[PDB]
């Protein structure tokens, strides 16, 4: 009877063995609003029976596994609303102690890279949980508190978030009530065609993120600080004379990495194993098996990849009181890595005002990283994973809504873009003087860490949610019906544009008007930039039953519930 539109639901995700996340009952959940905002109201919950059906409103300091799981009541809890008008006053991660442990290089590892984590995200809730935006939280905190008088023209709410998929992935897939968690990765080169005689420098990062409330998955340190960094590096490199480069550089933005590295794994699998049985007319696509773009097969030789650089949480570099500089940490693997890290050290020291210094790790295992997918295949090349931590994550809010613009060091971004741009130029064989594109940095940084309203001129739609959120969501309904959220399309169209080598006035009104190119506002634009499937190898699509099938559960199996609609309504009882 009063719909609150900026609401962010907890949704249901199925796995091989079970399920986690939340759902409302069929027809939604409703109850009296009860506010927990201090120890007093917390304790007074256990003895509160003015009503059967209760919607608990939580100050976020009380939203954690221990605190929520202890809410046992004779009344039954019908839902939770989490307020975001205040932040947590302590470090908090609802994610795993070792994200993606079993899908990486060290399945038997005893390390805990994220040791503060309480794993709250991976519990199965039989009632709905919503977060709400700042303004709405203020209002709901107000009315939920007003209920404390105890007289009954009181305030209540209804939470609608019915998840069709349930139980486990085998079950929901069979019924068509869920879809694989996945999406599209994006890679790019400034070369119009990669010289298959040159070695390739691969510079990459995981751009997808996680959260309890996935519509709020900014993941500033987790991913998006690095995403801004690498795009800003690419924009800066777009303006230099790259004619001196004797190696190819490929930039890769891997999707759905937080769900078992499926983006890097799928791409690598295709590099090593793909064979097309049936091509389309101009052989630009494969009909069987379906691939919308064959550039990877045409241009990229796995064995020519001769260096891998990965960005993996670089927005909370640690202040060193000695040097008066912030530390990033170099986690290395493969062979002949000191040659590469020596250049990084040099660039970081090359100018007086640098606020960045590099340190080695003390750990003997790489942290969870996309480079792990390549190291499963080769140990022959130098791999450098750049992070902001030696061991324990510097990110105090890993996989959580509070991993936002206030969780990262904007003041280090220019230095990191400059250092990485210059570094890449040097190892590609150049000696250019880099000027970073500050205008671009200043637009993109708040765009991906606060409010995703930038570069909409490149888009055909406006985003429904202005909170940047990089959760991969679902791959699609089949291999021929792929889906991508706004965030992926924006990264794709922006990367494509920055790396363009040609643009022609044609008055095109759609990409199909443009031969071997894309349409941007009446220009046909040419760029060596490409989408690629990011999807577990454990799935296959049966065109017979027209359904996804689990063919190998050794690969990551995550399938997000389908749902019709989500809504939060407040009303007087
Ligand atoms: C998860 O959330 C709960 C709920 O807030 C956290 O428990 C709370 O932790 C704080 C700090 O430890 C406790 O506050 C302290 O109270 C004492 C005595 O009352 C006071 O001397 C201190 O100055 C501070 O106020 C608070 O009482 C406690 N509340 C409850 C109900 O346990 C918990 O720490 C969080 N846990 C995790 C893993 O994040
Ligand atoms: C992919 O690139 C690799 C590495 O350059 C090529 O494989 C090699 O062939 C060259 C000589 O032609 C040698 O330098 C290497 O000893 C070979 N190593 C192997 C076989 O791993 C290979 O030619 C390229 N692959 C394709 C499909 O052309
Ligand atoms: C909510 O917005 C208010 C008003 O702008 C601001 O003071 C407060 O810091 C914000 N809260 C959070 C947690 O962002
Ligand atoms: C470095 O930073 C200082 C402090 O802002 C600035 O005044 C100076 O011009 C810069 N110096 C150089 C060498 O760039
Ligand atoms: C299952 O996939 C694993 C991937 O870790 C692979 O090693 C194995 O060959 C596969 N087994 C089957 C069912 O083919
Ligand atoms: Ca086209």
From Swiss-Prot:
SUPFAM superfamilies listed in its UniProt record: Zn-dependent exopeptidases
Superkingdom of the source species: Eukaryota
Cystines in this chain: 10-22, 172-178, 276-286, 447-454, 508-519, 514-524
Subcellular location per the Swiss-Prot or TrEMBL entry: Membrane
Keyword Transmembrane helix set for record: yes
Glycosylation site list: 64, 134, 301, 353, 552
Residues on Extracellular side: 1-573
Membrane topology type: Single-pass type I membrane protein
Family: Belongs to the nicastrin family.
Assembly, per entry: Component of the gamma-secretase complex, a complex composed of a presenilin homodimer, nicastrin, aph1 and pen2.
Protein name: Nicastrin
Gene behind the chain: ncstn
